[PDB]
Design an enzyme around this catalytic site. Structure first.
Site, mmCIF file in Angstrom:
data_model
loop_
_atom_site.group_PDB
_atom_site.id
_atom_site.type_symbol
_atom_site.label_atom_id
_atom_site.label_comp_id
_atom_site.label_asym_id
_atom_site.label_seq_id
_atom_site.Cartn_x
_atom_site.Cartn_y
_atom_site.Cartn_z
ATOM 1 N N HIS A 237 0.621 -1.631 0.535
ATOM 2 C CA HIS A 237 0.361 -0.038 0.110
ATOM 3 C C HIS A 237 1.203 1.462 0.500
ATOM 4 O O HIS A 237 2.433 1.321 0.185
ATOM 5 C CB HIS A 237 -0.892 0.011 1.035
ATOM 6 C CG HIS A 237 -2.193 -0.709 0.806
ATOM 7 N ND1 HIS A 237 -2.859 -1.347 0.283
ATOM 8 C CD2 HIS A 237 -2.210 -2.155 2.132
ATOM 9 C CE1 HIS A 237 -3.233 -1.885 0.524
ATOM 10 N NE2 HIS A 237 -3.630 -2.509 1.966
ATOM 11 N N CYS B 73 -1.352 0.866 -4.110
ATOM 12 C CA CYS B 73 -3.079 1.809 -3.832
ATOM 13 C C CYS B 73 -2.530 2.501 -2.008
ATOM 14 O O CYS B 73 -3.042 3.315 -2.261
ATOM 15 C CB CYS B 73 -4.081 0.496 -3.224
ATOM 16 S SG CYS B 73 -4.957 -0.294 -4.711
#
Lengths: 204, 205
Positions: free
Chosen positions: A91, A133
């Site tokens: 992430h 992300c």
């Protein structure tokens, strides 16, 4: 001053491909599990080995261990190597990547390979692939590749597919350009501070 | 699925090259004059005309006029055009460019040309060249960043390359040469590509 000049790619070794693979996170980060990142990891491992890289993967390192590992790799000798590849699959909040327990600024990771700090990589391609992300290339000869389910992510699947067919023949940026098209059909991006053409012709 | 596929570049027109040139600034911004930006402006004007572009320059627009101009250009028809080029030569604080009197976020400028908003540019290259002391808005966007009285290094070297190789080379490989040229000076510029195909400027019929 030759417009068709390529990077010297006939050193003893291709170089290292570092893969940091992050699937689960420390509970108080409240980050979702990244399903099929391991598929991505293995896919990248196949493709990069086939192109001659010594691939080293690490899974779910905590910040301390990751910095230790990357700092270590930044300080071995790359004198007899073509180039360096580093991949992050985790992430990302801003210009940060997540380790298992905390954020790290991408600039602090990439900066370890700038010329003033990693002499044996000067004038050689330094490629970072970041699937998360924001952060511009650290300096000359840096190439940043941004991505912007259980069988992997679109970006890695399509990158790996292209590496598989064309990696040994095409110029690397034109290959990424294909990846842009592929993904779009189902948008990713690369930023280049490269100074020459980059090819991964099979070695002797 | 052809790895040598090029963008269609045989439309009636090459397209517009927008140049926003900023030399002086509103006093309370306390921004230094950009000496030799006019040299850059003129240099880019030559090279781009030579490549078939309709070049429109604007000097020291205030934010309102700049927005009006760019929003207007984003809303004409590009259906009979190859591509679009837009240049900013100003100061830049962050992901902002300066007009004469204020900052403007680059995303609000590039966003005007995204597919959902500028239909006649869909699947055509949209090239922004930013020379200033933001990721591509979407598919087919190409961002070129530079990251004295006769111009800046980046514009000089970009323009010299456009002059020699512009009519021949693939545009990204040309930008790569500019990286090398600028690096040789005794800084390192950058491009970010969301292009889907090879880009050439071959002389038109």
């Amino acid at each position: 001053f030759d417009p068709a000049e390529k990077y010297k790619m006939d050193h003893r070794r291709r170089g290292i491909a570092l893969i940091f693979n992050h699937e689960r996170f420390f509970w108080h980060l409240t980050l979702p599990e990244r399903r099929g990142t391991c598929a991505d990891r293995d896919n990248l491992t196949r493709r990069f080995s086939d192109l001659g890289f010594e691939v080293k993967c690490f899974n779910d390192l905590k910040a301390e261990e990751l910095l230790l590992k990357i700092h270590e790799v930044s300080t071995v000798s790359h004198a007899d190597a073509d180039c360096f590849v580093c991949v992050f699959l985790s992430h990302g909040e801003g210009n940060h990547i997540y380790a298992y327990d905390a954020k790290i600024e991408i600039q602090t990771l990439t900066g370890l390979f700038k010329g003033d700090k990693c002499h044996s990589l000067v004038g050689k391609p330094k490629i970072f692939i970041i699937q998360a992300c924001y952060t511009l290339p650290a300096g000359a000869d840096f190439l940043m590749c941004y991505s912007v389910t259980v069988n992997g992510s679109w970006y890695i699947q399509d990158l790996c597919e292209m590496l598989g067919k064309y990696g040994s023949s095409l110029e690397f940026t034109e290959l990424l350009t294909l990846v842009n098209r592929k993904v779009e059909q189902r948008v990713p991006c690369f930023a280049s501070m490269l100074t020459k053409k980059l090819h991964f012709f099979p070695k002797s």
